[PDB]
Amino acid sequence: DVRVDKAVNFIKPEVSGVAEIQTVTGLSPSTSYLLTPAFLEQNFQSEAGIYILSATPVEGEGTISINMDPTVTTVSGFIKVKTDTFGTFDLSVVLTTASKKQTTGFNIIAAT
Amino acid sequence: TDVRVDKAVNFIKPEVSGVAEIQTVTGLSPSTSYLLTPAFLEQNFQSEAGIYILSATPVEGEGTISINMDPTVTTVSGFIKVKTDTFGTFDLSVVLTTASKKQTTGFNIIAATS
């Protein structure tokens, strides 16, 4: 089968254009996961500016892009990452404008 | 043990507002379960008035994909679990609230692999 093992929100980095590390824990050791973006009922115009998030694995493939530009809107990409022996993996997450404090996230999918 | 995107598929563009149509997805492995997740790339949902709102549900399966581009309440969420028939197909029910929103959205078909 394929299932969503965990649904997590993206972090909200403090400084525009400066990525921060997001660590996901508690997963199965040395296991391949696929991450896909998702978000629910968000107001991306609740304050000035454009919500633009990029996420990449420190060790893996792919990029998630969430760009809510009203002219050119993208919610796409997927990440392949394998946990270490502890059941953890790290992403690098950046917001182009850090005052966009909407909540977005991803699904963590495994075959089991 | 591993997982991959088997294929990326665009959602249909229903012709009539509010009237669900079937989208038949083909070419997969017989009698096999997949997960579907939403995605879209570089769309201008404001090329004309009105809101792009799509909902998709398998005819036989679990979950609903929702893509609601309302600027006050924007959703790109849900995931569908669906099993193919013995010929490698499955059907979705897809409904667009305003059919004149001809933007392109879609889903990833996620599969187990080695």
Numbering used by the authors:
A (entry chain A): 7 to 118
B (entry chain B): 6 to 119
Give the original sentences from the paper that presented this experimental model.
The Nodaviridae genome comprises two single-stranded positive-sense RNA that encode the capsid protein for viral capsid assembly, the RNA polymerase for RNA replication, and the B2 protein for host RNA interference suppressor. In this work, we have determined the cryo-EM structures of T = 3 and T = 1 PvNV-LPs at atomic resolution, the crystal structures of the P-domains of PvNV and MrNV (PvNVPd and MrNVPd), and the crystal structure of the S-domain of PvNV (ΔN-ARM-PvNVSd) in the T = 1 subviral particle (SVP).
All structures of the PvNVPd were refined to resolutions 1.17–1.22 Å. The structures of PvNVPd from two crystal forms are similar with a root mean square deviation (RMSD) < 0.3 Å; and residues 250–368 were resolved in both structures. The structural fold of the PvNVPd consists of eight β-strands, differing from that of any other known viral capsid protein. The P-domain monomer folds into the core jelly-roll topology, forming a β-sandwich face-to-face with two pairs of antiparallel β-sheet. Four highly exposed turn insertions β1/β2, β3/β4, β5/β6, and β7/β8 appear on the top regions of the PvNVPd and might play an important role in the determination of the antigenicity. In the dimeric structures of PvNVPd and MrNVPd, the domain–domain contacts at the interface are 2-fold symmetrically formed with a hydrogen-bond network between the main chains of the antiparallel β-strands, β3 and β6.
